[PDB]
Amino acid sequence: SALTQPPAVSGTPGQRVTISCSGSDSNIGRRSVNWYQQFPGTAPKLLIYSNDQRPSVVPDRFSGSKSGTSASLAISGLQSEDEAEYYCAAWDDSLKGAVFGGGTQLTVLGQPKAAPSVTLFPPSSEELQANKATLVCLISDFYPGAVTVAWKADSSPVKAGVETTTPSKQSNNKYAASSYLSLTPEQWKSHRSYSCQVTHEGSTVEKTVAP
Amino acid sequence: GLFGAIAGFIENGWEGLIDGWYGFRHQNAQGEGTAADYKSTQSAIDQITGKLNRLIEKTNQQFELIDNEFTEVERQIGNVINWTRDSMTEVWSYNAELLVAMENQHTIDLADSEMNKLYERVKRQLRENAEEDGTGCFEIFHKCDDDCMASIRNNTYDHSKYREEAIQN
Amino acid sequence: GLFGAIAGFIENGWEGLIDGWYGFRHQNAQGEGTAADYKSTQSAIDQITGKLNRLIEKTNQQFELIDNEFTEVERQIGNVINWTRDSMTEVWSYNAELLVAMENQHTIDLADSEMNKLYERVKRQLRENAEEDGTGCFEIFHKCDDDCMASIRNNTYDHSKYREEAIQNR
Amino acid sequence: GLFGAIAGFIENGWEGLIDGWYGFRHQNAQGEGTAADYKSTQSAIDQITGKLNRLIEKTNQQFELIDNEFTEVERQIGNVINWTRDSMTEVWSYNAELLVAMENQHTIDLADSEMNKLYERVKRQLRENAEEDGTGCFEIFHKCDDDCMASIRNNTYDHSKYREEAIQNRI
Amino acid sequence: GDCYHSGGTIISNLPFQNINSRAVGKCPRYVKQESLLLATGMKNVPE
Amino acid sequence: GDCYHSGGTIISNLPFQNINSRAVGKCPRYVKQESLLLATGMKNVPE
Amino acid sequence: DKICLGHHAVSNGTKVNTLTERGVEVVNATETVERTNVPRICSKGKRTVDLGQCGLLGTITGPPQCDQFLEFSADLIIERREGSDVCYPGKFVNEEALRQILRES
Amino acid sequence: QVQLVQSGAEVKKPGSSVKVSCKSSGGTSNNYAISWVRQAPGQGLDWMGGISPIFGSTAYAQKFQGRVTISADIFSNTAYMELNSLTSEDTAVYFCARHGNYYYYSGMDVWGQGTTVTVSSASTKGPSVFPLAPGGTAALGCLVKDYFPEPVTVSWNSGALTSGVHTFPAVLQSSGLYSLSSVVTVPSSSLGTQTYICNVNHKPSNTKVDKRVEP
């Protein structure tokens, strides 16, 4: 905190988007502002410095401004490659240190919805011999990148041993996730049906395995 | 001491100036303000670092034992070896102390020089609207505010805006 | 960089100025004219040449083989010879690179110095009839012709001839 | 030659000035007077002395005979010894002449520097009451007496006492 | 380390060393002096 | 020429040489470096 | 209106090194280390004796190959790899000291 | 053109200390300030402090003062950050970054690649590997269970089969161990002819397992 940004902004290719950054007198009010762009799992890149100055390697569609204790980054002519996290930053004369905004995730709009492919594997025989049982639900090729997962024992909701990953972006710009159900070989035997239910934008895809 | 700035006509340095080697202390209507200059601080520091990188160099040059600490070599060649080695110790020792003294002279005057390059530049900015008092200060002969100072700092202060004003005085 | 002139407050040099290291570019009523200064160009050149003549010296000092490329000398004395020769290679190599770096610093600052000696001189000539703008230029505060330029160049320009004129204009 | 003062825009030095390296020669109503500056003379001299004390150093380093002037040593080791000693002679001779030339450059420019530090200081004292003629002189634009000179010398001359006087007197 | 003597290794970037004149390998050059300080700052003038 | 080695003569006025460390006669001094350039001009600042 | 002094410049200068910086471009620079070999022994004006098949030490004892060298005069003595000191097998004790004496003789 | 190269990933137990390095290669950074900035999983950037080693300044964020030590060795062109008394709150990626200048106000224009530090009470453990058994196309794979820390590499048929392979990002269990799955999509006709084997390598435990997946 110290600097406050919207958690999210979005736009279509060619649209103009702005990301705001609210501060106080001890930072933005009295000091110069920098902006950084960060792609997932990679280091940030300096986008703007000295409030409105742009590094030579940065495209001119990026611009910055500062008024009062606030700042704004404007991206003219949004491109698909601009989907990233954006951080504002400034020195704070009160904390005697550098501060950052919480970050804004920019989404590029206009991409076609894609329903999730699901694959469900039952516990392997080898694993049962080791007195454990794992149901593996593999979700791939969905967009937007947000699904929810419900596990069905018979027709009843499981309320234990369910662990699901965050969604991650695939090479094809769609998303993948995975969810694991941990059961005793005993629980695997106790019911006649287990089902992985993946809901995506209201619509539900389902798969099922039987012991 | 070469140029006259540091330990010359500037009386001393400012132990409060944490954020630079060189900077500005001003007095006007509003208040008193201090900020260290970047462009010239960087400049000196960079010449110092360029000196270091030249000396902290590693010789890629390997030497082996011609000598023996466990069973002494025969005495005549032992004595030639030892005499050569001491002679080299002489050369390197002279080289070491000379090199360091000379670098130091030059480093100090490098500093005097950059101060006296900050000065002479600001002086040049202000044209005829102020005066050299001679303790490393400029008496401004017109009222000026804290956004006028900053315009001197980041090198935008226009002279022919305040010219006439500052002239009867 | 020592004096602030070259690569300092003068922004750059003039690739059109074939006939000197230092010179004059003026703008007045008549036209625009360029001519390189002799006295200070010569001055620098002469100090560079005086550096060269000192290093381009030939050592009158003779050395002979203590060694043998055809039948190797005995091995212990061979190893002392080689170790000494290498140690000399160390000394001379250090001396060589030091001498050259140092001469270079000095050559560069020699140049900065002579520029900033041309400047400060012309400045002194013009007394109160012009002003330091600070890019290595003098704004002259009286109309002046091309024989007035030449009189600055060959160092004859009289000040108290144009004094009053250029002063009200300030 | 580095700073432009000595053998630059000052035309020459004063063989009558026994009592310093740097000093003052003035012309006013009363008469003409000469006196050498202490503060800057001392300054240069002290830097020269500080150079000397560094070279006039004695090496505390002892060497013995590896050689024999009366009955020559065996010839091969004789030849290695001689070749080493001569190589040391090369290095030291180069060191000697380089050291001395460089100290000399620096000593000369040390002198130029202190002159052109006397100058620029006096200039600073006088503010707007006089002018650079450019032969190492200041034309004073107000009448001044011999107790005014001394106040320039020992650095007490007040400017805003003679300001107006000397300012109209430049038009 | 690349510089050895009977009593160990000299590990350092400095150009000289006052540890052992018989060190071998790739070493700072041996000198007489215990210390030689190189200025990295300016003249220090306090009140 | 006054400076010889097994593969010929070093004919030059320069103070140093990188040709042969065993040259004999009256020779430029042998050094490690292939090149060391001496400035004969000023700082070069273009547009 | 104005007069301006200034220094010269070239479009592509050469990088040198300083106490202070590396690869600083200057106007004109010159080389200081000789890199150029002359693949011959330059003997102009010198009394040369090229020993050929005769070994330096041979000039003293005098095996047949050295017959033309029993009594020579030189400023510059050139030994060859094919040179031999000896006809009847054997060696010189302290040969290198003797060569060194003879080379400068 | 300078690059900053940081030391590699670290796996640490609670209460220990970690020292991460940042080497300036292709030139020195000694004349600049370098800062350390961390990013906790899913969170924003957070300044730790910085150092500008020729200038002579070391600065610290108040919130880390006393627990972090920042330093530099000008001779190897390297900056360091050491953080003591580690807890899971310190699990994060740590970046070094060079400022446009000798101090900390200017924008940070050169960044290192980052160093992951994971603080956990789990001890290194290699995975237990199980087969996932299978139209036109079929789906078969391997479940890679209960390992720590990341990463695991999975190949198929000793690297001979690359097509149709999709290795999912691991899930981090409440136990502190990871699990992942790798599934390959393959012609069901080539079911009773071509053999399918997954090769699982876990460097940290030096574990290497081959596992046959049969219909």
Q: Residue D149 is encoded by which pair of tokens? A: 């000179």
The C-alpha R_g of chain F, in whole angstroms, comes to: 15
Triad D90, D95, D100: Cα angle to 5°: 135
Q: Hey, which chains touch B, using 3+ CB pairs under 8 Å?
A: C, D, E, G, H
Burial class (CB in 10 A: 0-12, 13-18, 19+), B31: exposed
Residue whose entry in the numeric block shows the structure tokens 């040390």: D110
CA D44, D45, D46, D51 dihedral sign is: positive
Q: Which of C13, C63, C103 sits opposite F45 (nearest CB)?
A: C13
| Secondary structure class of A42 (helix, strand, coil) | coil
F25 vs C contacts (CB less than 8 Å): 62-63
Shared-domain flag, residues A9 and A28: yes
Domain count, chain A: 2
Task: Report CA-CA distances (Å) from D83 to C65, C67, D80, F4, F32.
Answer: 9, 11, 5, 17, 21
CB pairs under 8 A between B and E: 87
Q: Which of D8, D83, D105 sits opposite C63 (nearest CB)?
A: D83
Strands H34-39 and H45-52: antiparallel
Shared-domain flag, residues A100 and A118: no
CB pairs under 8 A between B and G: 15
Nearest-angstrom CA–CA distance, H102 and B23:
14
Residue whose entry in the numeric block shows the structure tokens 């301006």: G4
Shared-domain flag, residues A82 and A46: yes
Q: Which of E26, E36, E45 sits opposite B13 (nearest CB)?
A: E45
Distance from CA of G3 to the nearest CA of D (A): 19
Nearest-angstrom CA–CA distance, C100 and G32:
9
Shared-domain flag, residues A85 and A161: no
Nearest to E41 by CA among B153, B136, G21, B20: B20
Q: Which of C6, C58, C108 sits opposite F13 (nearest CB)?
A: C58
Residue whose entry in the numeric block shows the structure tokens 């005495």: B75
Interface of G with D (CB under 8 A): 94, 96-98, 100-101
DSSP assignment string, G18-50: -SS-EEEEES-EEE-EE---BSS---TTS-EEE
Distance from CA of C166 to the nearest CA of G (A): 11
Determine, for residues B108 and E44 on separate chains, whether the beta-carbon distance falls below 8 Å.
no
Method: X-ray
Chains F and G contact (Cβ–Cβ under 8 Å for 3 or more pairs): yes
Long-range contacts of the stretch H188-195 (C-beta < 8 A, 24+): H188/H134, H188/H135, H188/H136, H188/H137, H188/H138, H191/H134, H191/H138, H191/H215, H195/H157
Nearest-angstrom CA–CA distance, C85 and D86:
12
Determine, for residues B77 and D77 on separate chains, whether the beta-carbon distance falls below 8 Å.
yes
Determine, for residues B44 and E15 on separate chains, whether the beta-carbon distance falls below 8 Å.
no
Q: Which of A34, A101, A124 sits opposite H132 (nearest CB)?
A: A124
Triad H27, H31, H32: Cα angle to 5°: 95
Q: Residue H201 is encoded by which pair of tokens? A: 């390598």
Give the helix/strand (H/E) hosting C157.
none
What is the CA G46 to chain-centroid distance, rounded? 14
| C170 CB-near residues (< 8 Å, 6+ apart) | B128, C131, C141
Interface test with C, best of D3, D77, D83, D106 (most C CBs within 10 A): D83
Alpha helices in chain C (DSSP H): 38-55, 75-126, 146-153, 163-168
Q: Residue H88 is encoded by which pair of tokens? A: 């899971």
Which one of A85, A110, A135 terminates a domain?
A110
Interface test with G, best of D72, D73, D75 (most G CBs within 10 A): D75
Nearest to H6 by CA among H19, H23, H30, H18: H23
Interface test with C, best of B68, B75, B90, B113 (most C CBs within 10 A): B113
Determine, for residues E40 and H76 on separate chains, whether the beta-carbon distance falls below 8 Å.
no
Q: Residue D94 is encoded by which pair of tokens? A: 């180069």
Distance from CA of B9 to the nearest CA of D (A): 8
Cis peptide before A211 (omega within 30 of 0): no
Cis peptide before H149 (omega within 30 of 0): yes
Domain span at residue A71 reads 1-110
| H110 CB-near residues (< 8 Å, 6+ apart) | H2, H3, H4, H29, H97, H98
Amino acid identity, residue D15? Answer: E
Shared-domain flag, residues A151 and A183: yes
Q: Residue B80 is encoded by which pair of tokens? A: 């030639």
Q: Are H117 and H92 in contact (CB under 8 A)?
A: yes
Determine, for residues F22 and C69 on separate chains, whether the beta-carbon distance falls below 8 Å.
yes
Q: Hey, which chains touch H, using 3+ CB pairs under 8 Å?
A: A, B, E
Interface of C with D (CB under 8 A): 43, 47, 54, 59, 61, 63-64, 66, 73, 77, 80-81, 84, 88, 91-92, 95, 99, 106, 113, 117, 120-121, 124-125, 127-128, 164, 167
Triad E28, E33, E34: Cα angle to 5°: 85
C36 vs G contacts (CB less than 8 Å): 8
Nearest-angstrom CA–CA distance, C44 and C51:
11
Q: Residue A7 is encoded by which pair of tokens? A: 């958690």
Determine, for residues H143 and A32 on separate chains, whether the beta-carbon distance falls below 8 Å.
no
Determine, for residues F33 and C89 on separate chains, whether the beta-carbon distance falls below 8 Å.
no
Q: Hey, which chains touch F, using 3+ CB pairs under 8 Å?
A: C, G
Asked if B7 reaches chain H (Cβ–Cβ under 8 Å), the answer is: no
| B68 CB-near residues (< 8 Å, 6+ apart) | none
Which one of A52, A78, A110 terminates a domain?
A110
B53 vs G contacts (CB less than 8 Å): 22
Shared-domain flag, residues A142 and A183: yes
End-to-end CA distance of chain F: 46
For chain E, what's the residue count? 47
Which residue does chain D place closest to C81, by CA atoms? D80
Nearest-angstrom CA–CA distance, A196 and A118:
9
CB pairs under 8 A between D and G: 14
- For H48, list phi and psi in degrees, rounded to 5: -95, -35
Nearest-angstrom CA–CA distance, A132 and A186:
9
What is the CA H151 to chain-centroid distance, rounded? 8
Nearest-angstrom CA–CA distance, F33 and F17:
9
Shared-domain flag, residues A23 and A64: yes
Which residue does chain B place closest to H103, by CA atoms? B19
Which CATH number do you get for residue A205? 2.60.40.10
Which residue does chain D place closest to G95, by CA atoms? D76
Interface of G with F (CB under 8 A): 7-11, 13-17, 24-42, 44
Nearest-angstrom CA–CA distance, C10 and C7:
6
CB pairs under 8 A between E and H: 5
Cis peptide before A144 (omega within 30 of 0): yes
Determine, for residues F34 and G33 on separate chains, whether the beta-carbon distance falls below 8 Å.
yes
End-to-end CA distance of chain G: 78
Give the helix/strand (H/E) hosting C9.
none
DSSP assignment string, chain B: --SSIIIIIS----TT-TT-SSEEEEE-SS-EEEEE-HHHHHHHHHHHHHHHHHHS------B--SS-SSS---HHHHHHHHHHHHHHHHHHHHHHHHHHHHHHHHHHHHHHHHHHHHHHHHHHHHTTSEEE-SSS-EEESS---HHHHHHHHTT---STTTHHHHH--
The C-alpha R_g of chain H, in whole angstroms, comes to: 22
DSSP assignment string, D75-125: HHHHHHHHHHHHHHHHHHHHHHHHHHHHHHHHHHHHHHHHHHHHHHHHHHH
C113: number of Cβ within 10 Å? 23
Q: Residue E24 is encoded by which pair of tokens? A: 């071998």
Residue whose entry in the numeric block shows the structure tokens 């006259």: B4
Shared-domain flag, residues A79 and A32: yes
Shared-domain flag, residues A130 and A106: no
Q: Which of B18, B19, B49 sits opposite H31 (nearest CB)?
A: B49
Which one of A58, A91, A110 terminates a domain?
A110
Helix axes C75-126, C146-153, angle to 10 degrees: 140
Shared-domain flag, residues A135 and A79: no
Q: Residue H5 is encoded by which pair of tokens? A: 């190269």
Burial class (CB in 10 A: 0-12, 13-18, 19+), B36: middle
Q: Are A62 and A47 in contact (CB under 8 A)?
A: yes
Distance from CA of C160 to the nearest CA of G (A): 18
Determine, for residues D79 and G94 on separate chains, whether the beta-carbon distance falls below 8 Å.
no
As a three-state string, the secondary structure of B63-109 is ECCCCCCCCCCCHHHHHHHHHHHHHHHHHHHHHHHHHHHHHHHHHHH
Q: Residue D125 is encoded by which pair of tokens? A: 């004292």
Q: Which of B19, B20, B45 sits opposite H54 (nearest CB)?
A: B45
CA D105, D106, D107, D112 dihedral sign is: positive
Determine, for residues A121 and H100 on separate chains, whether the beta-carbon distance falls below 8 Å.
no
Shared-domain flag, residues A105 and A4: yes
- E strand segments, chain H: 3-6, 10-12, 18-25, 34-39, 45-52, 57-60, 68-73, 78-83, 92-99, 108-111, 115-119, 128-132, 137-147, 153-156, 165-167, 171-172, 178-187, 197-202, 207-212
Q: Which of F8, F37, F42 sits opposite G30 (nearest CB)?
A: F37
Q: Are H95 and H80 in contact (CB under 8 A)?
A: no
Determine, for residues D76 and G101 on separate chains, whether the beta-carbon distance falls below 8 Å.
no
Give the helix/strand (H/E) hosting A15.
none
Nearest-angstrom CA–CA distance, B167 and B148:
18
Q: Residue H84 is encoded by which pair of tokens? A: 């003591």
DSSP state of H32: S
Burial class (CB in 10 A: 0-12, 13-18, 19+), H160: exposed
Q: Which of H54, H75, H76 sits opposite E40 (nearest CB)?
A: H54
| Secondary structure class of F15 (helix, strand, coil) | coil
Nearest-angstrom CA–CA distance, D103 and D95:
12
Determine, for residues H54 and B53 on separate chains, whether the beta-carbon distance falls below 8 Å.
no
Q: Are D115 and D20 in contact (CB under 8 A)?
A: no
Q: Are A71 and A64 in contact (CB under 8 A)?
A: yes
Nearest-angstrom CA–CA distance, A79 and A58:
13
Shared-domain flag, residues A80 and A183: no
Interface of F with C (CB under 8 A): 6, 13-16, 21-22, 24-33, 36-47
Q: Are A63 and A77 in contact (CB under 8 A)?
A: no
Distance from CA of G100 to the nearest CA of C (A): 7
Nearest-angstrom CA–CA distance, A34 and A90:
6
